[PDB]
Amino acid sequence: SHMQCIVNACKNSWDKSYLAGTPNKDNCSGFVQSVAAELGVPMPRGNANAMVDGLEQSWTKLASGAEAAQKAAQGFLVIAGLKGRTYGHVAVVISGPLYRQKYPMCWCGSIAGAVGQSQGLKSVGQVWNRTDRDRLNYYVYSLASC
Amino acid sequence: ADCTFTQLEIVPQFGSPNMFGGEDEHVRVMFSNEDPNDDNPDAFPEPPVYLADRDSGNDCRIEDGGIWSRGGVFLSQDGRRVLMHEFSGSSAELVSYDSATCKVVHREDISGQRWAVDKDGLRLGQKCSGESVDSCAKIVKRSLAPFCQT
């Protein structure tokens, strides 16, 4: 079978509004909630910070961005996540070449603007800044999706 | 004491490859584009940002910060300040730099807010249809005084 379940879910989720009245492109947590719902992967409720709190308490953490990309290539849902002061950020890690030989490709919505949005063409190291991208947590679900 | 900021267009530069910048009478700003497969970036995650103070002649580097929005660079009318939109994930801040030294003058966390800067000042919006501040149910004026430090 194909191993494009994660990417298909991201594409299908982009134009949805997980939260009533809020396009997923503008809401990182909503985008991730829509992706997980399509894949039927249980996800902590709440905003990005609350989601990271939940993932930290339950999901296995990967050692590196490189490992995150490999797991995504193997059909696992991998969430890159980092709390903010109020506005945290979550992104879906996908298969692809590592930016600066470290940072995996991703999809994400962002209230910061189009610059923070990725439809798979930006790495986590091009959505989070030079300091934050080295503080990322990579949470992987216990089961693969394809 | 409320100085006026004007948008600086940031465009591909001649010469050294992958450089994007712009200038007015007082200051030139340059960025490097290090995204190997995107020749038209909308942002610059890698320092340094190069500032040239045309009047004094000094060149300096902003060695840290970002990610710098390509469309989010503004110059004060007197050339003494460079105001820059910087973001990370879903967070964002506006940062003012001294054009002569590259030192930070002021930061303001604007995470969660839509925003615009123009002749008339800084606007911050809430309950918005989209990215433009004009899509917002409420738009508040925010003082630029600490950014100007006129």
UniProtKB/Swiss-Prot annotation, chain A:
Superkingdom of the source species: Bacteria
One example GO MF annotation: amidase activity
List of catalytic residues: 28, 89
Outcome when changing residue 89 to A: Complete loss of peptidoglycan degradation
Quaternary structure note: Forms a heterotetramer with Tsi1 consisting of two Tse1 dimers and two Tsi1 dimers. Formation of the complex inactivates Tse1 enzymatic activity.
The protein's role, per its UniProt record: Toxin secreted by the H1 type VI (H1-T6SS) secretion system into the periplasm of recipient cells. Degrades peptidoglycan via amidase activity thereby helping itself to compete with other bacteria. To protect itself, the bacterium synthesizes immunity protein Tsi1 that specifically interacts with and inactivates cognate toxin.
Descriptive protein name: Peptidoglycan amidase Tse1
Organism: Pseudomonas aeruginosa (strain ATCC 15692 / DSM 22644 / CIP 104116 / JCM 14847 / LMG 12228 / 1C / PRS 101 / PAO1)
Lineage: Bacteria, Pseudomonadati, Pseudomonadota, Gammaproteobacteria, Pseudomonadales
From Swiss-Prot, chain B:
Record flagged with keyword Disulfide bond: yes
Disulfide bonds: 3-148, 60-102, 128-136
Matching InterPro entries: Tsi1, Tsi1-like_sf
Entry keyword set: Disulfide bond, Signal
Gene3D superfamilies, A to Z: 2.40.128.650
Listed Pfam families: Tsi1
Regions that span the bilayer: none
Functional description taken from the UniProt entry: Immunity protein that plays a role in preventing early activation of toxin Tse1. Binds to a large surface of Tse1 and thereby occludes the active site to specifically inhibits enzyme activity by forming a hydrogen bond with the catalytic diad.
Subunit-structure text: Forms a heterotetramer with Tse1 consisting of two Tse1 dimers and two Tsi1 dimers. Formation of the complex inactivates Tse1 enzymatic activity.
Record-given protein name: Immune protein Tsi1
